[PDB]
């Protein structure tokens, strides 16, 4: 009963285009395929914009005011979006491929490079109401004979330098009567001109070529004309100058070569400040900070994005995207991290708060099929198409054990015991489930029982039964633990693809080819509910198709399903363009989400394979925080969260309940009524007002008197608030008071408070312990320095 909205894209920091630094210099805008991702470097946070282009993005640019962001795709279709409010403002079609877009430093005008033409347009005013036809063209310049490589703005918004493939750099005047000032064509270069820049005084013009030559132009007497006074050359053995940027204030030149290495130079002395290599792949884009101390580089082939602090030789950002589609995902039990797996065979650990990759594992030779955490969360387990199951610890980041079959059986699915001592993996070729001992690494036994390939596995978190599902049109419940083993087969109409198991361990849901989500009672081995999903699924006709989408049967099943931790919903995904969120007790579709809107992706709408990328979701899971769910797809890991909470969802609200009345109760010192009334309104701003207005003395009295119905909500509110709040000691004191008064009630109903308790445990563990550890070691470090005798 919560509203999920797309928040950010993990597994993806840079695909192509030009990366731009924010004017303040604290944020970096990187275009990610069909969307734009923004990274908060100072705060170490990230978000991805919700607006979506028809095709992959080609060029972007943010105005100095920080209010307008313009993004243009490969066909020239532009989307103008308010950066601050993150809302799309206008849509415009330039009807031509736009190589580069850049705002004027004044911000009134923005210039567009279209083939052999420079188009200059007027920027719409943000303050004005939504304008119907806001785009007006100031001018269009046609001087070049070949495509424009890039353009640069003068610091006074009066002159433009454009570099083209005509081996020429051409200067314009933005202002008509100043045409006579700057109407010159700079020639002399031997190969495509990549960049032309001004000095801070603008007296000097620096032009660079792809061959690796930098020319310094000065207006001088031979009566006065532009001449090349000095010539500098990059003596790269074979690397070509590909991308270039210049910072007039500090005189830094960052050139990225095709060999994958870049040079930082000081002009006009041509001093090599530093040389450093990103790899063997061409550096696609380079950008400079407003102050000039941070340099951003990136390349498209593997997807690089770094931020380099050349002053201190330190790395503000160094982040990577999966080369392949991410096949599987697993949340840490507390939800602090998520682990993703790809067809490459390399695992990556991701931090939800920062959105940045802490570590990467490449031990697996082939594609990793499944990934799962132990109940403790200290251990991580993965099964790969190389024929091995490997054991990983996220505390020391080491592979402490590896499991493999006698004949190298091909594994696709895995499960780990809640106690973390038994592992079962499954194969499409062997028809039997291999079992291992975590402590020993030996094959305990193999669980036979399917005519068909095992499609999925899962252990009950509490009861420890195994449910195995396969294309044999049946599901079996294995009671391996105990003196005697028992197997309970349950037949199903069609082949099962995905299985999700209730956290209570009393029910199991399974997805079949027919598009049916059937729930069975594990203890009774009887069906309790059925959901139809064939009609809700959205599948687009491929361009290669010769039959209609409606008549098609390609993917109206869900290849992955997962419960909500509350247990009343499932998120389902498959080889399709839809995620369907259903409700168990009533068997109805809550909401549906569109995975992508890129027309390049096949499903959005004789010896050679007609083979192109296809939109599909490999895996889906709910966040243990119960506020978000992530879907593994081709473009990356899409996370939808309920954080915004703009909706008004009152609980037990009455006429006497009003925000003013709640404040009146606070002024009257009636805290308990104010808190209850605030929760009834269910307003985050109001509860926060009441929450922090309670004096410390009155907390235990209030905590003892809170009604039981509101108890799970307040515990949840403290946990999510406390994780990012600065008031560590209040949030704990409330946890102490609430726990002390209602400790027995929570124990009686563990499931009702499961998610809320975990959120509390995240706060007391993932921030609070670390603070006291830094406090206590200093206390002990001190006592040595004073008690110990100093040296002679």
């Amino acid at each position: 009963k919560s509203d999920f909205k797309f928040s950010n894209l993990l597994g993806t920091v840079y695909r192509q285009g030009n990366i731009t630094f924010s004017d303040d210099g604290k944020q970096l805008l990187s275009p990610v395929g069909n969307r734009v991702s923004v990274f908060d470097l100072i705060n170490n946070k990230s978000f991805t914009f919700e607006y979506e282009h028809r095709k992959n993005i080609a060029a972007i640019d943010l105005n100095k005011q920080g209010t307008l962001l313009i993004s243009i795709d490969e066909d020239g279709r532009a989307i103008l979006v308010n950066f601050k409010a993150r809302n799309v403002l206008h849509h415009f079609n330039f009807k031509e491929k736009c190589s580069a877009v850049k705002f004027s430093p004044d911000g009134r005008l923005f210039a567009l490079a279209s083939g052999r033409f420079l188009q200059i347009w007027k920027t719409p005013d943000v303050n004005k109401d939504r304008q119907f036809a806001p785009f007006v063209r100031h001018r269009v310049h046609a001087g070049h004979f070949q495509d424009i490589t890039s353009l640069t703005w003068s610091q006074d918004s009066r002159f433009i330098l454009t570099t083209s493939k005509d081996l020429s750099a051409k200067i314009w005047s933005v202002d008509s009567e100043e045409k006579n000032l700057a109407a010159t064509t700079f020639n002399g270069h031997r190969d495509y001109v990549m960049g032309a820049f001004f000095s801070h005084d603008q007296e000097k013009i620096y032009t660079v070529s792809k061959d690796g030559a930098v020319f310094v132009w000065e207006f001088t007497k031979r009566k006065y004309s532009w001449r090349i006074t000095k010539k500098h050359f990059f003596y790269a053995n074979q690397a070509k100058v590909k991308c270039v940027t210049f910072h007039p204030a500090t005189r830094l030149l960052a050139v990225g070569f095709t060999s994958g290495e870049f040079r930082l130079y000081d002009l006009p002395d041509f001093t090599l400040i530093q040389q450093l290599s990103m790899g063997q792949n061409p550096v696609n884009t380079v950008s400079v900070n407003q102050t000039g101390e941070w340099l951003a580089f990136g390349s498209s082939k593997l997807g690089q994005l770094l931020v380099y602090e050349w002053q201190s030789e330190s790395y503000i950002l160094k982040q990577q995207g999966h080369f392949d589609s991410t096949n599987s995902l697993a949340y840490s039990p507390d939800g602090s991290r998520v682990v993703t797996a790809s067809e490459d065979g390399k695992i990556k650990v991701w931090d939800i708060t920062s959105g940045f990759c802490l570590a990467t594992f490449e031990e697996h030779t082939s594609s990793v099929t499944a990934v799962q955490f132990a109940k403790r969360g200290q251990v991580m387990f993965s099964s790969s198409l190389d024929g091995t199951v490997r054991a990983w610890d996220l505390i020391r980041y080491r592979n402490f054990r590896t499991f493999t079959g006698t004949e190298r059986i091909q594994f696709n699915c895995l499960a780990v015991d809640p106690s973390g001592e038994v592992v079962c993996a499954g194969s499409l070729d062997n028809f039997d489930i291999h079992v291992w001992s975590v402590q020993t690494g030996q094959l305990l036994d193999a669980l036979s029982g399917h005519e068909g390939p095992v499609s999925c596995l899962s252990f009950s978190q509490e009861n420890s039964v195994l449910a195995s599902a396969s294309w044999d049109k049946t599901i079996r419940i294995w009671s391996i633990f105990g003196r005697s083993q028992q197997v309970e087969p349950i037949e199903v109409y069609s082949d099962v693809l995905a299985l999700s198991m209730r956290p209570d361990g009393k029910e199991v849901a399974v997805s079949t080819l027919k598009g049916q989500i059937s729930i069975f009672n594990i203890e009774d081995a009887k069906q309790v509910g059925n959901i139809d999903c064939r009609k809700d699924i959205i599948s687009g006709r491929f361009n290669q198709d010769r039959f209609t989408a409606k008549n098609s049967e390609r993917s109206k099943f869900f290849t992955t399903i997962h419960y909500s931790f509350d247990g009343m919903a499932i998120v389902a995904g498959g080889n399709n363009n839809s995620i369907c969120l259903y409700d168990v007790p009533n068997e109805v579709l809550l909401k549906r989400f569109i995975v992508s809107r890129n027309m390049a992706l096949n499903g959005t709408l004789l010896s050679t394979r007609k083979m192109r990328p296809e939109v599909r979701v490999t895996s889906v899971q709910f966040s243990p925080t119960a506020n978000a769910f992530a879907a593994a797809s081709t473009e990356g890991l899409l996370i939808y969260s309920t954080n915004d909470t703009i909706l008004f969802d009152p609980f037990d609200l009455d006429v006497d309940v009003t925000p003013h009345s709640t404040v009146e109760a606070l002024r009257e010192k009636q805290f308990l009524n104010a808190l209850v009334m605030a929760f009834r309104l269910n307003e985050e701003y109001l509860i926060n007002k009441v929450y922090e207005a309670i004096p410390i003395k009155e907390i235990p009295l209030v905590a003892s008197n809170i009604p039981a119905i509101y108890l799970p909500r307040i515990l949840k509110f403290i946990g999510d608030f406390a994780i990012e709040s600065q008031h560590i000691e209040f949030n704990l004191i409330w946890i102490k008071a609430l726990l002390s008064a209602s400790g027995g009630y929570i124990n009686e109903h563990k499931y009702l408070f499961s998610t809320a308790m975990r959120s509390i445990q995240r706060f007391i563990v993932r921030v609070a312990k670390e603070v006291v550890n830094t406090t206590t070691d200093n206390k002990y470090t001190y006592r040595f320095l004073v008690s110990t005798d100093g040296s002679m």
Partner: peptide, 16 residues
């Protein structure tokens, strides 16, 4: 000036 324009030496020989 271009049309696009806006609008001691300490010796190193030291005794040892």
């Amino acid at each position: 000036v271009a049309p696009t324009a806006l609008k001691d030496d300490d010796d190193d020989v030291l005794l040892d």
